[model samples]
Target: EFKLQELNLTNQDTGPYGITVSDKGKVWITQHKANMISCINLDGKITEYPLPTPDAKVMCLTISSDGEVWFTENAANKIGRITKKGIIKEYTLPNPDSAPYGITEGPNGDIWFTEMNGNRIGRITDDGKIREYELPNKGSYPSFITLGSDNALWFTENQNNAIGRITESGDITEFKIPTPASGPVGITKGNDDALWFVEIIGNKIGRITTSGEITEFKIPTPNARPHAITAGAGIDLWFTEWGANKIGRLTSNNIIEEYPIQIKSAEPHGICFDGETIWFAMECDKIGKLTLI
Candidate 1:
């Protein structure tokens, strides 16, 4: 059995989605529908910051080494930055309707993001100078991104059936998945220094090396619909089974174990390891954590 704790959010349709852990073990989340962001500390203290842009439709939020948090505005066509002091700033994208979906800090302190509709990846410098790189497949719908072990940025190409990696200087290469129509989403650098990601449609977990070799592991549940994945504190990889309503762990040796959520149909979205606990976005007025005690 696995031990879990949930901190219930307000009962509104807040859409508590996307996650990132601060160095102090605080969990930060984006309320997409409510246009706000919140930080829940170990003591369950909740502090919120409202986005300056109304209906920003925040999709993903990530913490940077600069003590600031950056996020994407899926509908507002902009990127947002919030600091520890609650200061917020919004920057407009050159393409007004790119519908940015993901945000992650690059190796060089710059911010990189994905454009789901505009078919491009973008980078923003500290001063907010934006540069965008066009994807070879115009309709790839680049999704969630993470900095890879190779010091490059890797992201999922939802419609392209591939993984895309872009260097700090903006050169990109796509690695195709073995499974057709895999619909890859969330990605993270695993503890073993390889890139691990979820195949939402393919119902599998995929690993890709820095040199582009790929391997896929099928989940036992036929339509588990794995959404987001992150490496655990140990050698295991943890993921959210959105359709099955479970938190699953895949050992480095390929053993898979799934724990059902205390509440059915939480619609979990993002997952992360905040130093000690595995935190996840429940998407339905709650943020949950899994601690295998």
Candidate 2:
């Protein structure tokens, strides 16, 4: 069981989508519709900053070791970096319609992201140098990505129903999901030393070993439409049930439990843990937090 808290945004239709916990323990989230980023301190204080680019449609975000926030602008065709002091820098993609999505800090401290429409993986250095790697499958719709313990970047292919692995050197491999059209959207490194992901359409959580072995656990609520996942306390992973309006937890032992959202059709999406509390983005203009009793 868990306690839930809802924090309504001051700005309506902000559409808080992507979220990450900074090294300083503050929660940062992308306000997609508002073209802004917001940060919430441990003390529950909220601060929001507007993007220089109008209608950026900021998507997934991650924090670098230095605490700088990096995120993707799917509609603006740019990769953005913001300093803790709120200074912003934007890098334009060579491919006009790349539709960049997921982003995470690479093993080398560079930023890595997925190009959903361009069918490629992109890497950018702090100074703004950029590189792109083409995916073998065109229009695979690569979504959320995370750096795995094995030093490779693991991501979900939403359109093709597969998990993709890419080396620092740009070598790419794909693992097909057993369930056809599963629509896997979120991927993350689990506490169990494996990559765990959510199958939005397949309604299951999947685990993949560095060696390419795969295992899946089905959600008890049929068609819960799990969308985002993150590493949780002690051998467990927590995810958002987008369709079911609940937060689900998956343990290393494959046990699952779901906590209902107070708001109907909250549409929970991005999820992250700040060491002690679990926070998620509700596309319905709020942020949800889960706490242990």
Candidate 3:
């Protein structure tokens, strides 16, 4: 059993999408419609930081190993970095309409993001240098990305129904999913040292070993539209059920459990575990907290 709570945001229709918990356990998130980034401390206090770019449509965010908050602005074709003190810097992508979305810190300490429109994977240094690696598959529509336990970056190709990996030196590889039109999106390193991901259209959970072995499990909920996934307590993974308005947990052995969100039509998107509690971004203008008893 667990306790679920909904914390309302001041700005309505801001569309909070990407979220990450800092080393200090503070929650940092991107507001897609408002062009703003905000943080929430454990005490439930909120702080807002406005972006310099107008109508940026901020998509995803992640905290770098050095404690800097990094995010992608989909409409603006830019990557932004925010210090803990709220200092903001933006880096423009050379490819127009890159539609940069997913972001994660690489094993080498650089920040990496997916280009949903540009069909490329991008890397940006903490100091602002940018590099892009074009994908062989045109119109791949890559979504979320994460650093695997094998020390490589793993990401999803939503349009192609594939999983891709890239090394720090830019070597790339792709693996096709067995389910057609799976539309895989969110991905994370599982506690079992494998990569786990969500398939929105397919309504399935997938796991891939570093050697590229793939396995999938179906969800009981019809058209659940599972979206973002993250590692939770022990060897379990907690994910958001976007279509069903619920939270699902998958154990290493494939046992699954779900909890419905307290709010109606929460439209949950992003999720992250902050050591003790799990925090999620509800596109319906609220943050959902799940505390296991």
Candidate 4:
């Protein structure tokens, strides 16, 4: 007993890579190759924000409760912040070669991000100050992060085959995923008070209890390559399957429903829910609107 529909949003210039939604139902999309942010409303229309930095490719973007939009510039090794009215400002990471991959706001006002190449986690205060915490493992390659109920930031150590938690004071604790190939990528705090995440190379949906227990959901398709996942407006979690080219919804009871992308090469990536419908980004140069009516 769930509803779903799809909308088409794409361009020839670059693909819609990462997605974030504001409290007002506005969708913010990132064009990693073109280095810009595109703002779209509920009707699937878009407004573009050009980068203040030259030749930057923005990988991920997030909207803070403070009403500002923040992003990670992958190619330029930088991060950017913009006001609700579209005023832009940029900051370089302490490590110029970090290659920031994902960015999200913590429960507090600080901006937290991942460094794929630098193998570290980054935090920046709203005042524009920055700090970097190196991973215990050399090639951990932390990907995306979400605030855990434990009042700390929980993230995926993609290359390290484990999940990590970091407190505001910089304490880190790592938990290993039982899966042989960890590739834990996108993650979100579930409505059920636990943590939910995607196992990209592992090809599964994972659940981690606050007590550190883990459970997994193996997708029916081989090499489905689940990427980003988010808590839907309903009591379900919605995620994008990059290799399978589909959108998947998993309920609290573990029911799964999947819808194919309208475009063959849609390559669904990031996903967010807008209370009434689900919104997401793609690698096929588009943004999709999925209505659960």
Candidate 5:
């Protein structure tokens, strides 16, 4: 069921970064450096929405359990919520220059995000009430986050070379990975009751059980700079290799399969699976979809 074709996104350098599908089956993606978000249906029809702020730097986004598109304006230090009708509201972070990065729905019926620059985790209610928690270690550069199988939030510490977990009540803990300076970035949970993430520097895929057990397997290609990961229609894991201009797939801990992107240095970033095909964002302005047989 895999198509090797790339769906061209309109606009020059849209830098399509974060991508997710809405509850109603609308495929959504972020145009980071280009300052906008867009929706695309499976038929290849697209509708684009420009952001209110000129410098939002829309880094990453997610659809909450309640069906709202929640995204981050990394440079503008704001979190934005966009409705199904394309109306967007921006909420400012309490701290300046926070540079919010990854975002996901929490098990507690709220939205949680990571602060790549401020080294913090943020939670926001649907009413816009915001709370921030400082990590136990500074300069950790927390990256992508996801709800763990254990009913807590788990995320990657790009700088600390560790994975972190947080309770709904704001308690935090970190588990160090085996490799130093591995630069773990994207993280997602699978049916195995484990969290899987990509190591941008370590050139590997990492696995962590809810109980804190971790294992790492090197990519077949060296220095691919794997940036983001998502679970496929079933148990398979899909990820982007920014350095090598490819996407990779794996279902277990030992073997990884890589697929090449036709565009040279497409800079694939964020990825997600929508019960159908695997969708990935290429910063070079393309939303790539893969088929699964």
Candidate 6:
């Protein structure tokens, strides 16, 4: 495994939760403890933007088609978005208990989020009016969401051990992970139209096609605790192992490669590829930079 070189940011806050790259190549990160969002330029320089809502523990952030950062502020119990210039806007959901976690935009430009505690998926427009789709059960605790080739919204049910999809018109579908109590966390569309996800407790990388066929690749470590994940340009799925303190890359052929961090327990949380490079945040640890080569 290779070693990760530290970039400019070195703050150890509660966590640097979500990270996303804009079309312009800027990277944005959320500090859950500081309740602030940090923007990183292509050259590794960082800029910090504060949330307008008090105590909004921003957990995850994603770039919308409009190039704005749409994120979940878990503690604030709200969803917020920030423009490239740092203009911040937020919306309060109807269910006060809805702890919005990781989010993604649907095919129709509407934003979707997982209600980690409230057991539902939420969709909202840019103007703040909100709509929620309840899960089959209250404790499903939908965690992360992504868009599929079918133009449907797909997400992970963290506590429920299932992956779910909801069409733009509100039709929902579910798929059970073969790995029991895998505690599926983050999910995204992979290079070959296969839906990929991270199994936090099960310590595996999972894949499922649109037809609902499923397969899994077990991590080398017994409890690597794979958390945030993303698909790289090479049709490989990349993930962060919080417990094992390493970053991994899995190719289409299922071959696995890994990179070690300089420090122990780096807890690499969120990771994404910015078209040409792979970037990730070390949840409450550090921000790192790597060239794909």
- Whole-model Cα lDDT of every candidate shown, in order: 0.89, 0.90, 0.91, 0.83, 0.87, 0.82
Compared with the true structure, what per-residue lDDT tens digits does model 5 show for residues 219-277? 99898998888887566888989888888988654579888877776788888787777
Q: Pick the candidate with the highest lDDT.
A: 3
Residue 111 CA displacement from its true place in model 3, Å: 0.4
Worst ten-residue run, lDDT, model 4?
A: 1-10
What TM value does model 3 have?
Answer: 0.97
Backbone clash pairs for candidate 1 read none
User: Whole-model lDDT for model 6 versus the true structure?
Assistant: 0.82
| TM-score, cand. 6 | 0.94
Reference-based TM-score, model 2:
0.97
Q: Residue 5 deviation, candidate 5, in Å?
A: 2.0
- The per-prediction tally of clashing pairs is 0, 0, 0, 0, 6, 1
Worst ten in a row by lDDT for model 2: 1-10
Residue 84 accuracy (lDDT) in model 6: 59
Q: Residue 100: error of model 5 in Å?
A: 0.3
Whole-model lDDT, candidate 3? 0.91
Q: Candidate 2 lDDT, tens digit per residue, 1-293? A: 67888878768888889988876778888999899999988798988888888988899888899889899999999999888677998999998989999999899999999999988899999889999999998779999889999999999999989999999999999999998899999999987789999998888999999878899999999989898999998988999998899899997579988888888768998999978889999887888888976
Tens-digit lDDT track of model 4 for 36-62: 788878776777788988778788888
Task: Output the lDDT of residue 126, model 3.
Answer: 70
Q: What's model 5's overall lDDT? A: 0.87
Question: RMSD of each candidate?
Answer: 1.1, 1.2, 1.1, 1.9, 1.6, 1.7
